[PDB]
Amino acid sequence: GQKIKGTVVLMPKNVLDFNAITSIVIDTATSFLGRNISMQLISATQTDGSGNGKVGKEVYLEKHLPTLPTLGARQDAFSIFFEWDASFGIPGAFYIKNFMTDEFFLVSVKLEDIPNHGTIEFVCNSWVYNFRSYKKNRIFFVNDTYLPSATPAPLLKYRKEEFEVLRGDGTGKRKDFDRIYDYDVYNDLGNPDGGDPRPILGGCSIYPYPLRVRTGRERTRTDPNSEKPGEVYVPRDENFGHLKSSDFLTYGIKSLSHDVIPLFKSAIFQLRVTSSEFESFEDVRSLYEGGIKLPTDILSQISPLPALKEIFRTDGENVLQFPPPHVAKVSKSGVMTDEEFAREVIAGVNPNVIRRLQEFPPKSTLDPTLYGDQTSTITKEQLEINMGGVTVEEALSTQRLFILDYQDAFIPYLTRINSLPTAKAYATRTILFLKDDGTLKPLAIELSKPHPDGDNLGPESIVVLPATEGVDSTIWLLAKAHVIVNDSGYHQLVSHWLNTHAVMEPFAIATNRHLSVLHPIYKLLYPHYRDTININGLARQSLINADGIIEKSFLPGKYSIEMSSSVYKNWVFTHQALPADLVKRGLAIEDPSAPHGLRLVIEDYPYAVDGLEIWDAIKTWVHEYVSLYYPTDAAVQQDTELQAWWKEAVEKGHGDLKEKPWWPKKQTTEDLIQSCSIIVWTASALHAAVNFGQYPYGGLILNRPTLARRFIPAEGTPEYDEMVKNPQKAYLRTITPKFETLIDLSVIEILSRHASDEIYLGERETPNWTTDKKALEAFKRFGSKLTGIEGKINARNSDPSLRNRTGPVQLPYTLLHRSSEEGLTFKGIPNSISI
Ligand SMILES: [Fe+3]
Numbered sequence: 001g002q003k004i005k006g007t008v009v010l011m012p013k014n015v016l017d018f019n020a021i022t023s024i025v026i027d028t029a030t031s032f033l034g035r036n037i038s039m040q041l042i043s044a045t046q047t048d049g050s051g052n053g054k055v056g057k058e059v060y061l062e063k064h065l066p067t068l069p070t071l072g073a074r075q076d077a078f079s080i081f082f083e084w085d086a087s088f089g090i091p092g093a094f095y096i097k098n099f100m101t102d103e104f105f106l107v108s109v110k111l112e113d114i115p116n117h118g119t120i121e122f123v124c125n126s127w128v129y130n131f132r133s134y135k136k137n138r139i140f141f142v143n144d145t146y147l148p149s150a151t152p153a154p155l156l157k158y159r160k161e162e163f164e165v166l167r168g169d170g171t172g173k174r175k176d177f178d179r180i181y182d183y184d185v186y187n188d189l190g191n192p193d194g195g196d197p198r199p200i201l202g203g204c205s206i207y208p209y210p211l212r213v214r215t216g217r218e219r220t221r222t223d224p225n226s227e228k229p230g231e232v233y234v235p236r237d238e239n240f241g242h243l244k245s246s247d248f249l250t251y252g253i254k255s256l257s258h259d260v261i262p263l264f265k266s267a268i269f270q271l272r273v274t275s276s277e278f279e280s281f282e283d284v285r286s287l288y289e290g291g292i293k294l295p296t297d298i299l300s301q302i303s304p305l306p307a308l309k310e311i312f313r314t315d316g317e318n319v320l321q322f323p324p325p326h327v328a329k330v331s332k333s334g335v336m337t338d339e340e341f342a343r344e345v346i347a348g349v350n351p352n353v354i355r356r357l358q359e360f361p362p363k364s365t366l367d368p369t370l371y372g373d374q375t376s377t378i379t380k381e382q383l384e385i386n387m388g389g390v391t392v393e394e395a396l397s398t399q400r401l402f403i404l405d406y407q408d409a410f411i412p413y414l415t416r417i418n419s420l421p422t423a424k425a426y427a428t429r430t431i432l433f434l435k436d437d438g439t440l441k442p443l444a445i446e447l448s449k450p451h452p453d454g455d456n457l458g459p460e461s462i463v464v465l466p467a468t469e470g471v472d473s474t475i476w477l478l479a480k481a482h483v484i485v486n487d488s489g490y491h492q493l494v495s496h497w498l499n500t501h502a503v504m505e506p507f508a509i510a511t512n513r514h515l516s517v518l519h520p521i522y523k524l525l526y527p528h529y530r531d532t533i534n535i536n537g538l539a540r541q542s543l544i545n546a547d548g549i550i551e552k553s554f555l556p557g558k559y560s561i562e563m564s565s566s567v568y569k570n571w572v573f574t575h576q577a578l579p580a581d582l583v584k585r586g587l588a589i590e591d592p593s594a595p596h597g598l599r600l601v602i603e604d605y606p607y608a609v610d611g612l613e614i615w616d617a618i619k620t621w622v623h624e625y626v627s628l629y630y631p632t633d634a635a636v637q638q639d640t641e642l643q644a645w646w647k648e649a650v651e652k653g654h655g656d657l658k659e660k661p662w663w664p665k666k667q668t669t670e671d672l673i674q675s676c677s678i679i680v681w682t683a684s685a686l687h688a689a690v691n692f693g694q695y696p697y698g699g700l701i702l703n704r705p706t707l708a709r710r711f712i713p714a715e716g717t718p719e720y721d722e723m724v725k726n727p728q729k730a731y732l733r734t735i736t737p738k739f740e741t742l743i744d745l746s747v748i749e750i751l752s753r754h755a756s757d758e759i760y761l762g763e764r765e766t767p768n769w770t771t772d773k774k775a776l777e778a779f780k781r782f783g784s785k786l787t788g789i790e791g792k793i794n795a796r797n798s799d800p801s802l803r804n805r806t807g808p809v810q811l812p813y814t815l816l817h818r819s820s821e822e823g824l825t826f827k828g829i830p831n832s833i834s835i
Pocket residue numbers: 496501687691751833834835
């Protein structure tokens with residue numbers, strides 16, 4: 001008829017296929033032709049007799065359009081032609097069927113020459129397999145934004161039925177082409193059939209945990225409540241592909257545990273070619289300095305590896321080396337100064353654990369019936385000798401006395417951790433003081449362990465005080481070392497894995513099952529969900545599993561992920577909001593005359609100043625976006641899909657805490673904006689701040705040690721005398737050994753790197769994600785408000801008064817700053833939790 005011209009853009013498999021990228025009249029676009037991809041339009045305006053929008057005639061792709069519109073690197077363009085029975089109406093969706101054996105990546109479709117109407121865009125960005133591998137036809141929709149009620153009457157069957165496709169039926173073993181999003185428990189970490197069973201985390205009150213994407217594999221012979229090892233399913237469009245093999249960071253990790261870590265083991269324990277121990281701090285450094293000399297046979301196996309090439313330089317071919325962790329401009333600090341040990345609690349890798357003291361001595365909230373007294377044995381008199389004239393009550397009232405308190409987190413797991421074969425750790429407490437130049441000063445480090453029975457005086461506590469001169473400075477350095485083993489343990493499992501990765505995948509599954517492609521709050525939030533179900537999947541398979549990388553490298557060992565469950569009991573959604581986090585830890589006082597409505601107790605607390613400007617910027621954007629679509633609390637009350645999404649996020653996603661009073665409703669405009677802000681703050685900035693500084697500070701194992709293998713040496717004993725004689729063997733003897741150190745440095749380096757692409761906070765995958773010029777305009781104000789913040793990061797970093805912003809390591813805290821480039825940067829806030 002008056003025939004609608006259509007334009008399809010797609011990408012073959014292989015431009016995004018790692019394997020085909022690495023390689024494991026002429027015309028190729030000519031084959032996606034004839035009877036190979038067909039398409040049918042669906043009407044937003046006209047209906048059949050049951051009330052559902054019309055479907056109009058299956059028409060195959062016409063020609064390979066050779067020219068660039070603009071396209072996008074490896075994109076191939078094509079035209080389809082649809083006729084016009086006038087009475088069809090304007091198309092608001094289409095159905096696509098591929099008849100080819102192999103999938104492709106559909107990226108867009110545009111519709112031209114609709115008489116009376118302008119060009120209709122579709123933002124597709126989805127893998128389309130051969131029809132026969134799909135339940136029913138794929139439906140792609142127009143980029144217009146609609147609440148449930150506002151959906152065109154013709155498009156409602158279509159909108160509400162495609163959901164049912166995303167939810168599936170809660171049964172069956174999922175296949176890779178499938179897009180079914182659903183929930184299961186973490187019962188896939190252990191291998192019981194092989195002797196290494198782990199407790200089922202989730203679905204219990206003894207073992208609470210966020211639920212995760214259901215995979216549906218067969219059961220274990222030993223425990224048919226646990227699922228077998230196999231390859232992890234993620235719903236197909238959650239596995240994001242790439243042009244460039246260096247950007248498949250998951251392949252880099254898969255190859256770490258598989259190819260490399262076993263060669264390093266062959267090297268240390270086959271013939272001992274390189275020793276299992278370090279003898280000095282120069283040895284640990286001569287890995288990013290000269291490098292570790294491995295034989296040519298081990299190097300020549302790592303040197304070809306198509307996905308580990310950015311992570312180390314294998315070449316030199318007798319040596320494996322690198323990278324210099326950013327704790328080097330000064331090599332003598334990180335690893336050593338007292339003012340940097342304290343500076344990293346507020347601007348380091350783990351910046352949101354630190355409380356303020358309000359009573360002295362410090363307490364325990366543990367349970368006196370189960371753990372004994374547990375109160376800190378540190379006295380007024382230990383603190384005060386370094387408080388420079390200040391009495392503890394003076395500092396308590398002037399909000400100068402602070403703490404890093406790992407007592408209650410560790411003491412429950414320390415009988416079990418200390419009876420593991422190569423471990424002998426403490427549950428630590430570190431008092432910090434705020435000096436007049438605005439710097440933190442460690443005053444004392446207490447070290448506890450239950451000793452045997454474990455509900456009596458067990459705690460067995462010692463207090464170690466600051467020292468510059470003698471043996472006492474070596475016992476301080478070993479006390480600070482035990483403190484940072486707790487801290488590294490906690491950061492990995494709690495600050496990073498649980499409070500960002502594990503806790504998000506519930507909302508990510510909820511959004512896909514209950515908010516249509518068409519939904520206002522799907523468009524807002526979906527960027528923040530990119531590649532989270534995918535690194536979580538690999539993590540459940542290769543990092544978080546039995547005798548994997550986090551258990552081998554961190555103190556709790558087999559009890560690691562179980563530790564994040566005990567700590568999960570205490571996770572509060574509403575406390576994940578940075579002002580609420582800050583206010584609850586004593587580091588912010590709620591103030592109306594003040595800045596972000598809070599007065600900071602430690603004013604040069606670099607993270608909280610990242611934080612608050614990226615927090616208000618996120619919140620101003622969500623407040624303005626929500627305000628475009630929900631005019632009234634009644635609109636937030638009336639959204640049939642938002643209620644459903646949120647009812648499920650809580651009750652099935654975070655099911656083991658569904659009953660908590662702190663869980664918000666979705667009855668007002670302010671409740672939507674803040675739930676969405678916390679989710680947007682978690683996925684973008686929280687993760688940035690606790691992920692990208694990992695190889696920067698933890699790249700030196702002397703700075704951030706992960707394992708603790710001996711207690712403080714006993715006086716008048718052979719191992720104490722070796723602490724007087726060779727202090728750096730007494731240290732290295734305490735912390736992570738050579739094999740564990742090369743497993744550690746090697747994953748936290750991959751995890752600290754940004755891909756070429758990545759998409760940072762004020763960015764979006766495509767410009768036309770919505771047809772709302774106002775949503776797009778308030779998104780460019782958001783982008784512009786974030787470049788301003790970069791600008792004030794760079795000047796506070798250039799401001800010499802703000803000491804904590806650089807410190808002895810002379811590292812400008814830039815983990816705050818949205819913009820960054822590939823890799824190794826100590827900068828950059830992604831949209832998502834993408835590694
Ligand atoms: Fe991460």
